[PDB]
């Protein structure tokens, strides 16, 4: 899984970005785990 | 502004450890992953460790696991390099380093970086 | 994994010139990170994802790519400008630096 709205769900090596509109959080991790 | 203050730098004999600190200031300590970051004395520079926010979970570079231990005091704004078994190639500048700000971050660059703190190994 | 080579090592140019710095992947990664450092100080992040600016960074800066190919490039060159450059990506575990493009200004 590569997007949540838990953060810490996301188990991303680097800081996943935050996508953040007016209310919509969600969190992506960019940096990828072969 | 942000600040991150790495101390506890120095000298060592081979084999021997070291326990460099670096202190933030200026943000939310734990809404943030940590790194450190070195430079070699050559200039090139490597990752060596990353440990995340929330839970902590903890990665290593390969050519240093299980001797380096980073980590963090959420509650003193802290982050540690813990680091035994040194070998001469570990000598170098040690950043502690985060990444950027809001609309210039999330995608695996240093967007702050302290002002290291230089570990030599030697006899 | 990841490992990033630089193009040229030392890159010589006169104020006013384009100079372009190219940075080569040994595959796919879909951004790419650039850091300005001079002697004494620790690298500044100098462009971030690809292409955006961080603050402070003059708009003489540039920066593209994909896939295996990204450069940084710097339509009129300054003498502020000499210093070592360094492309950094993490599309791909682990995060790797390229050894990076040292600017040399003529006078």
């Known amino acids: 899984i590569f997007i949540s709205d838990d953060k810490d769900s996301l188990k991303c090596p680097c800081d996943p970005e935050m996508v953040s509109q007016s209310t919509c959080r969600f969190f992506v991790c960019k940096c990828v785990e072969r | 502004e942000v600040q991150l203050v790495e101390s506890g730098g120095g000298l060592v004999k081979p084999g021997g450890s070291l326990k460099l600190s670096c202190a933030a200031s200026?943000?939310?300590?734990?809404?943030?992953?940590m790194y450190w970051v070195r430079q070699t004395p050559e200039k090139r520079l490597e990752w060596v460790a990353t440990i995340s926010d929330g839970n902590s979970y903890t990665y290593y570079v390969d050519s240093v696991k299980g001797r380096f231990t980073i980590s963090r005091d959420n509650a003193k704004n802290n982050l540690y390099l813990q680091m035994s078994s040194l070998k001469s190639e570990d000598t170098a500048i040690y950043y502690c380093?985060?990444?950027?700000?809001?609309?210039?971050?999330?995608?695996?660059?240093?967007?702050?970086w302290g002002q290291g703190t230089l570990v030599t190994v030697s006899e | 994994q990841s490992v990033l080579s630089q193009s040229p090592a030392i890159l010589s140019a006169s104020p006013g010139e384009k100079v372009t710095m190219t940075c080569r992947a040994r595959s796919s990664v879909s951004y790419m990170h650039w850091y300005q450092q001079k002697s004494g100080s620790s690298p500044k992040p100098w462009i971030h994802?690809?292409?955006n600016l961080a603050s402070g960074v003059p708009a003489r800066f540039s920066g593209s790519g994909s896939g295996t190919s990204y450069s940084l490039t710097i339509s009129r060159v300054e003498a502020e400008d000499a210093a070592t450059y360094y492309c950094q990506q993490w599309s791909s575990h682990p995060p790797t630096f390229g050894s990076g493009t040292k600017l040399e200004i003529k006078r």
């Open positions: 994802a690809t292409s």
């Open positions: 200026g943000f939310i300590f734990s809404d943030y992953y």
């Open positions: 380093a985060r990444d950027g700000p809001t609309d210039s971050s999330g995608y695996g660059g240093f967007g702050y």
